[PDB]
Probable periplasmic dipeptide-binding lipoprotein DppA (Mycobacterium tuberculosis), 497 residues
Amino acid sequence: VVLVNGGEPPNPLIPTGTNDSNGGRIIDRLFAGLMSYDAVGKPSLEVAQSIESADNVNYRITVKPGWKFTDGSPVTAHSFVDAWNYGALSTNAQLQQHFFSPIEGFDDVASRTTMSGLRVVNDLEFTVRLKAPTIDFTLRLGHSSFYPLPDSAFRDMAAFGRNPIGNGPYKLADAWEHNVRIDLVPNPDYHGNRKPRNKGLRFEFYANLDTAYADLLSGNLDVLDTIPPSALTVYQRDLGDHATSGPAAINQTLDTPLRLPHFGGEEGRLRRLALSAAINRPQICQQIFAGTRSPARDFTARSLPGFDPNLPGNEVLDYDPQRARRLWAQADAISPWSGRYAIAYNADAGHRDWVDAVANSIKNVLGIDAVAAPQPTFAGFRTQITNRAIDSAFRAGWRGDYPSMIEFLAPLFTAGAGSNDVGYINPEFDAALAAAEAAPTLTESHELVNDAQRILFHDMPVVPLWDYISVVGWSSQVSNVTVTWNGLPDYENIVKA
């Protein structure tokens, strides 16, 4: 069995209910959707036989015959349409609801329980009608929001999330020791694009990334996808040709909910711009991350298609203490600052050193009580953010689901999105993103997404910090280790001697 790092999923293992990378790395082993992604994020037909559109509005999707879930029930057009309707319907409160927003009839469900734009034709064909041309519709159909579900899921979704049944390359060993590990074995029914080259996976849920690194060194862990900052000056000596580094489509942000004291309206906008000017991204990237973080130049990631590091208005992400103080003073003229600025973080993923450095920078530049506030587990941390119980700023960050800049902005900054943790609402931004999605070409779409980012430079909904250089290490027992475009191991292709 290949031993790899992970963490406890904050939510049950329902694809439309999963918006985080701890649940996501598990769900993506268990299901197969219309398309699958290879290690560079390129989609290929998987469960779909064909996807046809002449107008880029009406899609006819034909399903390959003979696919089944591990409970023996068939994968059909109904398996997709029922899952997608389940995801879109507001009554089911699914975190991935916004991924269905381009489909005609989404507005009715987000008395109707189904989207008029989704129509089953027969067991192996269905049609999708979009409200408009949507540039990353085809590309998105490998994402977990679009996975199919078995008939038994809809009879009891809570039971399903504790014990999911899928159609993908792996299945749960039967498996999930809460806060300890989850065990997966190959699915013998699966004959798709991602056939496993190993006899199973064990995701170990480390309390401490320093422990995970010790386990890698001793051969008690096969793959470690996050070298902790404590090891970034020693890993190359320690692992040699058994560690690989490279840009990944992953970013980090400092999120300050607009509902906190002194952080709403114009006062909050000026304060966020001040915080951004009070952080020296190049200095933290050099000294805390040993060069394995690249300063943010926008709200997405430098390795994505269409990324531009020279957008007009990007100077809001430059270190400028004089500007930071001037902005903070203008905010204080609306309402005088009081109290503490606390940055909450999950301590299990090695964020301590950077959050300490950012708090210290804010305290020293602005002359305020800024501190770091650790929490022990990602799952607890994310739960606090989602139910809005959290009463401070907090770290956040996005791991791309598919290589599309629009995918790094729509889930976080549109009014209705489930991953909009701060309560940012700017209808002008939502409209600019819809314009980008409707562009006649990819080049024009990238230009319009970058035009839409000018609104984000003005409002600073969150503070973009940096993008990732992934560093992944592995044991002498495994080979064929490829790191994907979003920094994860290519799990199905890991071979164990």
Q: What stands out?
A: The two ends are 10 Å apart (CA to CA). The chain has two domains: 1-246+470-497, 247-469.
